[PDB]
Amino acid sequence: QYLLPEAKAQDSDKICVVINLDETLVHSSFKPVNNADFIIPVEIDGVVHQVYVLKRPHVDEFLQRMGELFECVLFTASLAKYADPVADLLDKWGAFRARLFRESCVFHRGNYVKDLSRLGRDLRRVLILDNSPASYVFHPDNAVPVASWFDNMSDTELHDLLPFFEQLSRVDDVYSVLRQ
């Protein structure tokens, strides 16, 4: 069936927003860095590798607000062994109602696509924030574009996007503003 169960009573009237992880909220690497926000041990074939994670500027204020405005869902093409621990350390306000990983993506033409149709939500009430356009090729008119982040600590994308989401949380049909 669908990837998500019915929305909880409190989230019924809210628009569902799919939020990507890598290069959107954080940026990670296996290359050691001293200013990492999180260090996550990831076991691969018996070997324990360390992943260094950097948080994107204003990510905390961003997730706290989005959590109040929408039914937030983490959707990533990364493996849970990596993404689940990052989400645990990152989401202190319980913004994420659900989390979907690589297995939930549809591999189509070489790319993992976040097929929003599999969510089980009225697409007129769904938005996706992903740094890679290829992630939503199946639903280009539900997408709220955002630039890929890596380490620019002067970034203000997440902060600057809030007013926009603020007004979208009020519309009845996202297509009315995103054109479709």
Binding site: D22, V51, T76, A77, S78, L79
Partner: peptide, 5 residues
């Protein structure tokens, strides 16, 4: 890779 390809 465990991260997003």
């Amino acid at each position: 890779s465990p991260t997003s390809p």
